[PDB]
């Protein structure tokens, strides 16, 4: 609805919805579904000096969208 005007993409819209849907699932069944909506990804470039630099071009957490 109003998220398009703010630049939020459709894919981010789906991720938010999926997290919310998994939130409503019973506590007994939440474990199965919640493993499909838990961010565990990052973006890194090997630094110059034997290091790793993270890249902040795309958000990882639905809170920071």
């Amino acid at each position: 609805s109003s998220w398009r005007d703010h630049g939020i993409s459709y894919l981010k819209y789906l991720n938010v919805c999926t997290e919310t849907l998994h939130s409503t699932v019973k506590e007994s069944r939440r474990a199965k579904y919640e493993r499909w909506s838990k961010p565990c990804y990052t973006a890194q470039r090997p630094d110059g000096a034997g290091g790793q630099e993270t890249i902040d071009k795309v958000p990882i957490h639905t809170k920071d969208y």
Partner: protein, 161 residues
Amino acid sequence: HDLPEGFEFMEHKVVNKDIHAPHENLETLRLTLTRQDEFLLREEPVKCVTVTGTNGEYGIYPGHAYKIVQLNPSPLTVEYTDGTTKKYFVSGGFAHINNEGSCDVNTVECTLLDDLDLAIAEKELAAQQAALGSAKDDKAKSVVEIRISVIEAVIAALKHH
């Protein structure tokens, strides 16, 4: 050095009906309900399927015209020729309806409405409502409102039956 395309290993292709061909009377809709590259139902004959797209609700029966529907967070109903009903809830995705008698509903998440809890759904709305009041900026408010819409749809879906 040519590489295979990843679709060559998939042996269940989509059959399209040539426009210049005779019509057939079909009493079964072959449904394929899918979540995150996993089919919950596969070419499963169902009498009807009810889906909520952005414009509104569609009741798809065999022979429905070719159409593509952008789903919204909502319930989805699958009624078998037995007259028995199976109700899922989806958070988004697309539904492709083919005039040949097939319906491939690909969703990001598709959970049986039984799994969802109304008590959990209600308290979660209250929390997001408080955040929406204190939501820092316009973007944050929009994201919070996305959650509320899904939650209210879930709450309304369960209160219906």
